[PDB]
Amino acid sequence: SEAFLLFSRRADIRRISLETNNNNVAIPLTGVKEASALDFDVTDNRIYWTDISLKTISRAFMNGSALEHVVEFGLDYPEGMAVDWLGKNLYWADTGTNRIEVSKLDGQHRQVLVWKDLDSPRALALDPAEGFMYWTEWGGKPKIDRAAMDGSERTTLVPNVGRANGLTIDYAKRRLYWTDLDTNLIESSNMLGLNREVIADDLPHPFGLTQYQDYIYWTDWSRRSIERANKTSGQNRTIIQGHLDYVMDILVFHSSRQSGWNECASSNGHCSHLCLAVPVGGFVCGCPAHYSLNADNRTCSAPTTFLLFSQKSAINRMVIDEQQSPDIILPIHSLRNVRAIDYDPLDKQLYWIDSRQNMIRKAQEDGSQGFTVVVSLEIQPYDLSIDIYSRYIYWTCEATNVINVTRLDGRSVGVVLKGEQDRPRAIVVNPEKGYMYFTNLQERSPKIERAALDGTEREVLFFSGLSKPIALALDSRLGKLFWADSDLRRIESSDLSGANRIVLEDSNILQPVGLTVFENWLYWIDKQQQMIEKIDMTGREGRTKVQARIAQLSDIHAVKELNLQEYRQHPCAQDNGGCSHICLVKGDGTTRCSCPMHLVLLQDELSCGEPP
Template identity: 40%
Template sequence: MLPPGYIKYHSQHSCVGSIERGFLCFGSPLLLFANRKDVRLVDAANSRNSSVIISGLEDAAAVDFYYAENSVFWTDVSLEMIKRTYVNGSQTSTNVITFGLLSPDGLALDWLGEKLYWTDSETNRIEVSNLNGSCRKILFWEHLDQPRAIALDPLNGYMYWTDWGERPKIERAGMDGSKQNRSVIISERIHWPNGLTLDYEDSKIYWADAKLNFIHSCNFDGSDRQPVVQGSLPHPFALTLFEERLFWTDWHTRAIHSCHKRTGGNREVVHSDIYSPMDIHVYTAKRQPASNNPCGNNNGGCSHLCLMSPQPPFFSCACPTGVRLHENGHTCASSPKEILLLARRSDLRRISLDTPDYTDVILQLSDIRHTIAIDYDTVEDYVYWTDDEVHLIRRAHMDGSGQEVIVSTEVEHPDGVAVDWIGRNLYWTDTGTDRIEVCRLNGTSRKVLISEGLVEPRAICLDPMRGHMYWTDWGANPKIERANMDGTERIALINSSLGWPNGVAIDYQEKKLYWGDAKTDMIEVANLDGTDRKVLVSNNLPHIFGFSLLGDYVYWTDWQRRSIERVHKVTGGERQVIIDQLPDLMGLKAVNMNHVEGSNGCAENNGGCSHLCLNTHPKGPVCACPTGIFFELLDDQKTCVVPDGFLLFSRKEDIRRMSLETNHNDVLIPIQGVKDAHALDFDNSDNRIYWTDASLKQISRAFMNGSSLEHIIEFGIEFPEGMAVDWVAKNLYWTDIGTKRIEVARLDGKSRRVLIWKDLSDPRSIVLDPPNGYMYWTDWGENPKLERATLDGKNRKTSDMLGQDRRVMVDTHLLSPRGITQYKDFIYWTDLEKKSIERAHKLTGHNRTTIHQGHGDYVMDILVFQESRQPGWNPCGVDNGNCSHLCLAHPSPPDQTGTANMTFSCACPTHYTLDADNKTCLRK
């Protein structure tokens, strides 16, 4: 083995070593080759003299070097990367190109202009970058079909490559990617042109064909084709040249061979028993001769890339992929002006529309699982996307920095997302929760806007200038709907001849609405009010999904065609494929990076709103408060505050809340599937509400914002009329008119037990006093009464709250009073027949006021949601009294002083029995 150290060209010999250790010099060349698992140097005259430059590689394929800096570059087709190391024995490497590669089979270094060129036989591209990977640009992307080997002639400004696709060939072009200089120089008697090398002294090309088993040569222009080695090579792969000899690797023989470059004679095996020989070069300064560098003076005056060219002035300025070159021919724009943002299942991509290559660049983001929808905020440079697998909405800057989660709870299947770039809000649809929600762009102030009548909401787009939002719903009755941006004034614009309306977009200038339908296989357009509906495209749309509009064009993704396409928005013509054969295409957003559309009253100081500013038509901006965080809007209609308490009431098919302190406006709590809500209660510790549903014959619970709906009691229940929460022991009590029982269970519905079943005629309302261990209920039987028992169902007695000081508070104009509650100095009650909520002073009955007058459903139960409404403690509040199932508190027998302290009993669900420890329940 050669000692580690620097490799230099010294005198007329190849030398390996260091100044400190001296040089080992050889008259024969050093061969640099990739061996899949490592990159090596070997003495062409004595294969025992070899050195591993870097080892432990995955799948090294192509290799090249920069002699002036003692560095080696290679491609790894498994890691899909290009890397660099130095010939100094350190075996350390740096990444050069880390994304956007699939099969980088060819690599070539421009030692004059200090550029790196490569081919990719999967993406079918030829690209260039600086040696550190910056300013990456695609040079050729059309009419390539599995390009492989690539060789450069920076002395004359040409590049050469082989293509072993359906029409094998060898091409050449200017190193600046000019189409005018591109030409096919070999297209006959060629099949698998694997290797390619240049003879700069004789102006010759040499290539190896692995199918036809030969090495041929020709002039740089393809003329004077000559056989060198004919028909006797098992499987040649790569080749190189030094002075009068050719060297090549062979997959079949697993060796490096050589011969005379003109005659093919003097063949010999240079090095054998190679694990997997791939690319090869002669490592010498002679293969990278010095010459005039037209880019050497101030980078040719180019702002970014200066690339060699075969035509005067023998260089061209170029820009990174997707960035347009200004008319001055030297300066690049700072970034693309128009782009497409694409959501794929496992990544997000950016496609510049400024340049004709339409290259898709993967955004450097982490933990992308299953993206669906995507949008972009030009003001702060944030990409927003939904992920259906991890149930999140995220954002990040275009360069991948600042990645963060915006919405992380109660996200099930977020199919649509839209940025309100004026009001600085984010809207989304969720086909799992069947909601449309909004929050600030940073995820705060979340509010449910629409929760009723949505079946399969998908795409959503906004018109902040006019105060409208539009969305599609592909449920049983598909439709396209519109509402104000606060969810009011909702109407169905299109509700006929639709199947799966997957995408929707707005032309703000022409006031048009566009949509794509994956079932009718059409793209249609109408006015913003739904009138003047027309078909724009009706052919070759197998499964349209993502949808967007920019300038004169409508863009869409197609699942079946695996493509992104566009057509003119007026004529439906000029149809063009932007990206083809890219699987897993989802959402799409076309963006003008330099333009922000319109304004409204929310643009300045958030419209004066403390939380959400939502534009509406024709009213204009309105302030709104988050859902589920107990805010209410003050009379100034600007400020959201946390009230001391508020009313909760059930209204047959929904549950609502209402301010107690300010304007008494009621707000719908967005809970799905309520049919006939009766009794209500809550647990303040986790902000859950509980209710009975007489139609569904079940008891359910959800958080105050309507999320996490659970049906906790679903069987063995006939008409659940009354219900109450024991907030200390975390138990739930209810009365059932049908079964004539009072039952108890844990708050999650488990450990269910019948407490009272005897002498109950028509049990109705029930309330609890956990700190004192009592429950109270009404019975509407033949002898109506109010009863009391301890929380374990014992010590039952007829009661009127100890029978003392009974007074009539209100006795006029009561038609059918139902629910009742108390807050501060007032009592509140519902009246079924009047469909109202009223209040009066709790001691005198005076100051009677109707605070809510319904116009639809009956108002059923009512209660005050307030932290102080659930005070106190009992022994069940600590570790459930160490009971395995139910802990039921009750007063202890009075002591000698007549004081009754609180104690408890453990109890078991039906079909269980209490063990001797009086703590543990065992199945019978």
């Protein structure tokens, strides 16, 4: 190859030829704002970079074609990033989220590798032929750490170091190199952190570092330079280019920097998702976050039960497992103000209301197949609840004050509730019994009400002891209805019939705005307190703080694994009972058909038609 030196500065990535020593040219990119960490992939000569202003990781070819953003969510300060050229994996470290993560080079199958007791991981270096990765930490007590490249066997390699940067492996000579930003030194050690040596002690401000053949290269922010010296003696110092202020990173682009082999290089280890290098020449198959590795040690299966919780501009997933796996952002594009969420466990698709767009939208959990279900004539959806058997979304409309019903593919079913003085807000459906529950925020008269799923059999359950009942949940197994009142700052429950009303919690609650049932636990979100909390409906283990310091909480929704055999025993799950619009569970074990308020049931007693 032609050996190239690439460097980031401001919003540009530029290249200097190392055989001509002075030919400088910018990579023709658009949309970069703050270019930071750099790497490349030897097999296709793609370049990769992070951006601290956009909080993204992107890749492109050096002529600017195939510009793609491969990581776009869940980053804060992605200051370290490296390409695993053998397994075709992308690694990065974030000083904001305190995480080291991996994905495929196109961003698929993101997994969190290190997150516990991690204080600002900054500079990252990979050795996939051996199976180790190395990084510096800038938090608390700075240090250089080592782990397997599946995140296991984490150990401290260099304990006595300042904030360090430009961590670089000389793969040929088995040396580590870095700059110390607190002592302004360039140092080297062997792969075990031993045989330490100071390479240069007379540089005022060495920031970035890399290595190629007999030379180390660095940037100096006080000398506004990229410079080069003999990697063992520190001599033969030369100026690669001057008048370059604040160069954030430098990278030697040459195939000799990415050599070697591991099993991942040949058929990805027969791994379905990730092939991760593990120490001394090994490999292990890995899975996206919250997935599990099957008994064949090669294939991954998605989680069957989990918790979803939304913020203003993010939807997250949480699992309750022994590993205490971290929560993960879902990579759903174009969220602006998420107000409410739901999930279809049949087709495994997430649904949400965005009150900036006044839209109901849906996508798969990996963020693909984004689709608009409801859109504007002025609508303003407030809450939504899916009937998974008839395959309908029930949702409340704040502008027109109706309950409207829509098929999962966007075709409208119709409104089932409307009254001049009605203000339907929170809603949850119980298709197992044929009922729907909603809060009704009438002026000076808030209510909790229930009705059949076609709007008939409407009755007020509760009208006293309510100020702003803002969220509803229910559980068929427990046979219970749950609500939060953000004004009275308390959580209540009753039987689904409305009997046995009881306050569950009213202490240390500031602004409860959502709640959900997961097995025997009632979870809720406290917006003002920035917390998720849960309580045990059996009364045995009490009340637990699930996660704190979560800003802009908007909704929470638990997903239990679908019992497919049991699902298909619901009468409305088979062809909607033959009903064109609404299928009602009678309670006789039988089903009758019904219609939205603008249509009439026809003679076949299955079809709805336009009124005479």
